[PDB]
Amino acid sequence: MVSLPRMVYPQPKVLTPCRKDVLVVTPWLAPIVWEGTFNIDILNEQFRLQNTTIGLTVFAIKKYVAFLKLFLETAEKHFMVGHRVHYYVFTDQPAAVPRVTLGTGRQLSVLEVRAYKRWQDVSMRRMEMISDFCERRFLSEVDYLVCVDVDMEFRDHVGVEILTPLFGTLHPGFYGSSREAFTYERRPQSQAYIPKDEGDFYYGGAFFGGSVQEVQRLTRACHQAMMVDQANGIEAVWHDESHLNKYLLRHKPTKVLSPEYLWDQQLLGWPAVLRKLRFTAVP
Amino acid sequence: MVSLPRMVYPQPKVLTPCRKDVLVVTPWLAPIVWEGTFNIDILNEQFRLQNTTIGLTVFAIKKYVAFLKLFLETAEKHFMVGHRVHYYVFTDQPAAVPRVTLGTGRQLSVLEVRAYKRWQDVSMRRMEMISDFCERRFLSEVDYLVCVDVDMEFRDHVGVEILTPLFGTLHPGFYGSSREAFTYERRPQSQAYIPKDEGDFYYGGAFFGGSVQEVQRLTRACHQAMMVDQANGIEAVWHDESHLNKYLLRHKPTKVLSPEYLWDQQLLGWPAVLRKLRFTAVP
User: Which residues are involved in binding an alpha-L-fucosyl-(1->2)-beta-D-galactosyl derivative (chains A, B)?
Assistant: First the structure.
């Protein structure tokens, strides 16, 4: 990219690990993003000089519209602050979207979801609609897409350190688990099947993203795999999350976010290995 | 990219650092490549499925042609084995290039260097010629370029783990040093100037590379900066290495290679922090 200006910051210490308690790079040389691994001033400079725009997608269906107010208010406080942001709120109730005041350079669009009589089409809807909109809007409007669940709140910084062609996030229930305990789809009849001796991580369906092109590829692949399963009369154990995990096994993400980025404090507390709780379940 | 096949390998351990003695990721989230950070089977699969071709440039002038035989023979044993390779040997003595037997998928071209009466044009020649050839040949012929010194030998694996848009390599004399001890150009009159309170690492001019596009950008910038200095009657303290360091300060590399990749055992021994000595000075 274009040149960085002069900056004064502490010298990296080649002979001091940035973390001694966690893995900070995958075996395919993707950073695993934890507090202490990044200097956000450097990263903010890099992404601002590229005039980066980040799209954030969220689905709020039926009673989940109640979560939008806190979700958006806290995103204003913590998500990509200083950068251009475009929120895309997919909902069955446009009139229920709260009026949240946004900072400068930040916009929100409301998109109405296709109503479906079939639960099967509802299960596939997020991957289908994200894939479809990667064509209708996102390619023209944003550089990266971040796809998250709405029943959540931002409690701390979530910023440009996550941005990369393709990322997944360590599910908070499994980051310390052996792969045989991961709740992957285990039936060979499903497109999402992963055998007991395969798997890097258990990624959460509640937080993934990347460049628009990589997100279009991921979501199309997952949608097409779910349609195959539907034809074959099988529903993966964890729905689109199972397919996300199959996709990221075979297409390795270029960053992995630590569970700082996807947490549930009620269920899991605040372990010492989490220096920050950034994006968390609402009680 | 296209999907990886099923592979059986050890699960990554989220709560076990891959190294406890060294920094494995820069503060701008670039991997620092050390033994123990990568699974080469995964990386080989990724790069082979992309049918990657790696170009290697080397300059052998005057008596340095004597180093070519060992350089090329050891590159055959250790450099990008299994991948497509194109060696580009830039020399003032084409007839002195040894006939080294190459493995399948590997080729060598000899390019004669522009003779210069001015030492100034010789100092600039590598950056100028690499930049020029990024247009004449490299863009059409290779996906990545690796630019190294000839007075060296491969002693161990140097492979696709290094490949990325832009990389530099930690100079073996300075990896444990404070930035004020780095031998950057310190005169503000030079384009290569770096103040005492700036700098991430001291990168070696003997090993850098990246995608053809990024290498063209780097080498053009360094060439143009050296021409400014020549006009202003200043020669940077460490010549093109000083300019390389200025460029990589302001354009952060997307990987950094550890001194495993650039070593001198006669001067520095074999410290415990080096698990492998991959590319080393010839006594």
Answer: 171, 183, 241, 264
